[PDB]
Design a protein around this nucleic acid. Sequence first.
RNA 1: UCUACCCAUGGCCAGGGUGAAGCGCGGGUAAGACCGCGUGGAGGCCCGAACCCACUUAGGUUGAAGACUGAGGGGAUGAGCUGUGGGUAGGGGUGAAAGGCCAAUCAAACUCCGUGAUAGCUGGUUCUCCCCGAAAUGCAUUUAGGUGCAGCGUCGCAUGUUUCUUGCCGGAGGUAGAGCUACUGGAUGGCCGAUGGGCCCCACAGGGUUACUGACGUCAGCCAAACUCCGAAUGCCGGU
RNA 2: GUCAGGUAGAGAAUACUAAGGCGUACGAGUGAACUAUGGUUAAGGAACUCGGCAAAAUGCCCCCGUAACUUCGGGAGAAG
RNA 3: AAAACACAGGUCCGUGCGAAGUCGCAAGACGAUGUAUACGGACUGACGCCUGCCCGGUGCUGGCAGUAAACGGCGGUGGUCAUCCUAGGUAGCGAAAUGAAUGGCGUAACGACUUCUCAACUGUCUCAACCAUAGACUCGGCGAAAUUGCACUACGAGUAAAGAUGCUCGUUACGCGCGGCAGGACGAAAAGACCCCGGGACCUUCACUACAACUUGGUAUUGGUGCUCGAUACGGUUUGUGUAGGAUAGGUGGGAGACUGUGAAGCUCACACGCCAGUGUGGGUGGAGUCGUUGUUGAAAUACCACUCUGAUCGUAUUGGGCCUCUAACCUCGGACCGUAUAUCCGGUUCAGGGACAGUGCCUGGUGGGUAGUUUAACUGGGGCGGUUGCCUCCUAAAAUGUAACGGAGGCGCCCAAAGGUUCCCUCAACCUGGACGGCAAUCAGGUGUUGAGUGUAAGUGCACAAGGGAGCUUGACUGCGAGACGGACAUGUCGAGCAGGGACGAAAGUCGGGACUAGUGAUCCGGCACCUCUGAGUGGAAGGGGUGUCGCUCAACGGAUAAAAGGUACCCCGGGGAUAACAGGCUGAUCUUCCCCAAGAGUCCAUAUCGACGGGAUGGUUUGGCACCUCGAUGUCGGCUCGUCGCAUCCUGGGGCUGGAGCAGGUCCCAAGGGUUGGGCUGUUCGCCCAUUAAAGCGGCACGCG
Length: 466
Amino acid sequence: ENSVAPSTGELALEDRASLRRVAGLSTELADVSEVEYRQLRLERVVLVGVWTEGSAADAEASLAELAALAETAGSEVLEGLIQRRDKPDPSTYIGSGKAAELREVVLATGADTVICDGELSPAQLNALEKAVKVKVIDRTALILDIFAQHATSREGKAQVSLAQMEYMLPRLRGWGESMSRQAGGRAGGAGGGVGTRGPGETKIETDRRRIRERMAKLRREIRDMKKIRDTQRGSRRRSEIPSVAIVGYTNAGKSSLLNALTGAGVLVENALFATLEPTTRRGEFEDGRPFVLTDTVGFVRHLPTQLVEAFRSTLEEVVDADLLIHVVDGSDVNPLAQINAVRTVINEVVAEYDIAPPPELLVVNKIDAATGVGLAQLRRALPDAVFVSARTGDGLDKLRSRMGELVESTDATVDVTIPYDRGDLVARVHTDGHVDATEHTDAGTRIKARVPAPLAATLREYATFA
RNA sequence: UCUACCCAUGGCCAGGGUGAAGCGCGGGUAAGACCGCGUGGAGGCCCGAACCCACUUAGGUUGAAGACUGAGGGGAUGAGCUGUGGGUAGGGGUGAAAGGCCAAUCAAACUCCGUGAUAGCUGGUUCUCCCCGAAAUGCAUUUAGGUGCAGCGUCGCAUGUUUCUUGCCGGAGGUAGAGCUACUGGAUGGCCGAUGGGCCCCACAGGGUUACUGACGUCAGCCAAACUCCGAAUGCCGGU
RNA sequence: GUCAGGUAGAGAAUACUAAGGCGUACGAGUGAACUAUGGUUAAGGAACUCGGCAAAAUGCCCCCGUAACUUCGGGAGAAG
RNA sequence: AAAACACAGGUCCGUGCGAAGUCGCAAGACGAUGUAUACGGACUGACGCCUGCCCGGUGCUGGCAGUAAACGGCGGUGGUCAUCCUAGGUAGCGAAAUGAAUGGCGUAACGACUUCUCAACUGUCUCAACCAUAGACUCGGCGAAAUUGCACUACGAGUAAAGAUGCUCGUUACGCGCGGCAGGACGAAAAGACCCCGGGACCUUCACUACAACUUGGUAUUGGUGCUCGAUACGGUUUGUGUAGGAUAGGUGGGAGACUGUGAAGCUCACACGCCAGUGUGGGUGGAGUCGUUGUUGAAAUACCACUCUGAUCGUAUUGGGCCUCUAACCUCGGACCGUAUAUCCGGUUCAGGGACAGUGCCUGGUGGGUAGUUUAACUGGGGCGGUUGCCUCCUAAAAUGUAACGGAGGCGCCCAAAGGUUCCCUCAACCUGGACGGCAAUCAGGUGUUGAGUGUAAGUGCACAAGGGAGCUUGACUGCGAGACGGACAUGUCGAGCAGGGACGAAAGUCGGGACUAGUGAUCCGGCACCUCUGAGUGGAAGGGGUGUCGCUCAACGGAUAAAAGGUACCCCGGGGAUAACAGGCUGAUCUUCCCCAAGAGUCCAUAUCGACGGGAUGGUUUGGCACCUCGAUGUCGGCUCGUCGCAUCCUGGGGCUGGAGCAGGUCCCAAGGGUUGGGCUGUUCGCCCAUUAAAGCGGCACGCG
Ligand SMILES: Nc1nc2c(ncn2[C@@H]2O[C@H](COP(=O)(O)OP(=O)(O)CP(=O)(O)O)[C@@H](O)[C@H]2O)c(=O)[nH]1
């Protein structure tokens, strides 16, 4: 450019941001012992994203999410290139100044792997590939691959496959044929719910006709596994046991809490989304009533829009709850970015299924290893919260106390006396009603029990006034 | 003589509306523009018969008809329709251009001639009995549904068991099988245990001795079209 | 190509008729279904359907009254 | 019948006048009885809007001045080519009714155009009924046609060239008619238009080869004058370095005479040469002999020549090219007369213009789809796209040879003057030991080391006896041959003992006609080059031919159609094919569909109320497929309508078990096919979405039933 729209000194329209090959942390790197063959850790993925929003500090966690995605998905990151583009690029994504830079960046990797962050229309992916000719899958395809490798239940192996088909259907030509040509089991290779390839050799399939047919069958099957789930939850619904759910960002001790308060024993792997199918377990409020506890799947910033069906059961558990719990990973940078996304998910849930929002119990987790990011009322960034340490079980008592006190009691506290002949009633109050205490009176007892509705009218006749 | 276009010379277009220029009276206006009122009758104007077309629908669809009928439809003073007489002719004509039309036919008319065109393609090829009796393979092919040569039939002449079967004898294999501690590779479980780690007491030595891992071997149990230390049965080549 | 009666009518349209010319060359029956061409229809009124295709509707004369827009001519027989 | 063509309007290009353009071989014609405000061709298509930074000079019309992105540049930058003022239909201006500001927006009126909505109306429909006429039907008369192997021509389930009136086993059926329906006779009709193969046709082009047309030149018509550059012929003293030197000498053969007193040698000077070798020309007091083979230089003498040529460029004869003209050939559709009463024809005479130009002939190059004749491969699990095509090596290949696939892996189109021949000698790879660099690791020593290294090059077969590693000498990487065989359609391809001649190496025996072996290549024709004793169109020669050796092809589609060749056809046509595709049928069941088996787990505890991973086994024949068996001398497609009929894998209704069945209501499984299973708006929908109901708004087969 000699005199074309005078912009000398930039060639990228931005004084500071322009072409931003920061390589600040260089994402992250690995170490020895990944040296058996070349496919145990091969996709030395380079990352790229657009700073199109506020502080690059709050966007650093955004690319940390992608780095963690790659780490849990297997293949280890090798480089990261975050562009300070003012606004998202309309047709391409890289910046058109890095359209050549990308190749000389990726000559430093180990195997062909470049990853974008935002969801890319096929318009992007038609030339973003031609930029380097190396397979590029965005963050949504990475989430779909993670779930594909983590799917284990029949329901999940259909929801994940449907989500992948619904994501790949728009971007069939070009990109779709690109991973059709590339059949080695890459990061985009996914696998569907099989995980151990199977349809992984077909990846996300290629044919639009075949995709459409399998999509119709999967729609029908997911329809069936909702009138299965309603049956399975009927027993809880009919008994109206007080339900408590645990939501929040992934890796925030969401399953460790449910293995901590109650001795459930669910998988607690360190990687990202692993408890991909909701599981619920019984529990007793320390003082009185019993309850049920449910741990959900896991939320992410800018959640993929093809995974709402895979999250549908999670949403159902969220709606059918009394005390919602968003667990925040205390020992992590910016412990609020997770919170805003989780909350936003909550609003879209309460909107899609119109219901009175339930109280949201707040717990900060991993404060045992935290360096006190606030170390004050600053650490009380949300002043209402309980600082539990699931790795050590510190706030369990305080949590177990306040969670019940914040669930509300639908009991009926009465004072009743029972002549000894009808010890059946004494036993029924002592095993169903959660009696506080009493003194063992001459003929009866001064029982002060938070008796329920079935026995409320039972004990009305044998009442007392003292 | 149909149709396309052109030339010469003739004819036809019921009826009913609208109302251009111009002109006049004027006004209007400084005057002009213009505005009113009259006359006037223009227009590839309007509605609509004859006429010329052919938009829709139904019928016909071995028709009444090798392109029509019924009902509606478009133009109908015009780049109009039409009579009579002419002109342009085939790689040519004409074409408000459709590969349209040029005598019921047009991505090159018809007729006769070259001419009995040619067709690796299709069809057809007419009486009897007797004797023998296939092939659908190889090679080559502007070749793959054709053909050339070889193989297999038959007839004749020459030779005469040379053919074939069985027994015996002499042969070369690397198949079936099996084996791998005999090569090249895969691979299971131990034992031996280098080294690397092991890193602490604390030396930096030496020790403990590594969740360890692990050279090197070693034992056991396996695998292979393109592995063979091995290795048949049949078949094949000679002799008898 | 020539002629173009009468009444109704603007009309060479249409209907009925004068002059004149014809009954046009297979007939006779018969309430079959069905097909064609006509006719009518309760109550709804395009629900039919690819699609108001087809049919139905409007239609004449005289008085009034006539929109957006406009190339100032028209629209316009507006509509009513 | 239109959105296509045309159109008025516009823009560009060409044309100065029997014009350009077109028809004709030409003459001639139209253009036009016109004349740049006109005519021809090409694009666009009323009308409007969008839209130049402002005039110096590459230059232009020329008289300085236009001009606009006439050419830049939008740059300062007015401004709005106006003062000054810069060699991209362009981001000028970068201005969203909408990349077009020469291509996009608008646009009144108009349209048998396309797509929607409203009001009115209606048998279009709910959902039909009735009436008349013309057929149909009956009676009398006349009286066809396509079709046709047959015939006292059933149905089910099978079988069969895989869809049976004809076959098999059963079930049903008295003989002959009439009126109707349209499910079959793969009904009739048309030697399938789709698809493939072969032929053709017409079209296109930077396919090949030609031609027309245009055009560049040479020359003939075609001549004269001059200038004019010289391509021209014919002669010329002095000049001329080894020149031996009476001394810077062209010979030559005559050579002994010429120069002779107007002037010998010797000269002296101006000037050529200038290599002062010093010759000389010319000029000058100038003369009264130097001379010459004087043998002299191979050789004159500056004595001559007759030549030779050698001086060194002056005259000298014809001659090309250029320029200038001129008239006389030739040309004029410029005029005037005459034949000629008639005459824009034609010819003749004459004047006026051109004029050796043009036009035309023969020759010669260039452009040349304007036109023609033709080419444009085959294989192929249809064709196309993609790949391949010859040679070598493995596996397939079933222990001889051979053996296919669009089966599994690779290589080659060479390299080497030594990496060939011979003689002689040697042994590796790896391991251990210990030595400065030195390291697991360059070199050294010792020890193990029997083949695991190497072998130019792929792979295989081999080779430690070495074919592997060295050194010496050599060219057998020969000539004339080759008994006998291998492989073989043929053409090719191989091996070969041994003989003779001349060699190499080795003392000799003996080995040597390329390389451990198997790839490294191309027939024939045609034509080069060298040698030879062949032959030489009457003869002698030569030309040409012949023989021997050898050379020229990615003729790689590699047994090689021509030396030379790409496409389109939905405008297509013919000849064939179910040898081969699209629909349907048939086989398979990968895919699909419905279940089942084991039980990790989920389900508040809880494998099995409801679900069920990881794996396995099946049914069915509805999806997409795979195959290519029937049909290409025709088996008419999707959807909708009408009419159905059947299965159950049951949507509703009916009967049961379990339940995480308290009741109400559900979930799941079993039994159950009698009946029923709505009407609309959107969608090609094939699918589906939406609206209002319903007991419910089932899924499927029947050529995806039914033209
Ligand atoms: N140090 C520490 N680590 C914790 C604490 N709580 C949870 N973690 C860690 O978080 C990790 C993620 O395990 P998990 O409990 O599944 O977290 P999660 O949020 O449920 C991840 P998912 O959403 O996929 O189930 C575990 O490895 C666990 O060790 C804590 O209090 N301290």
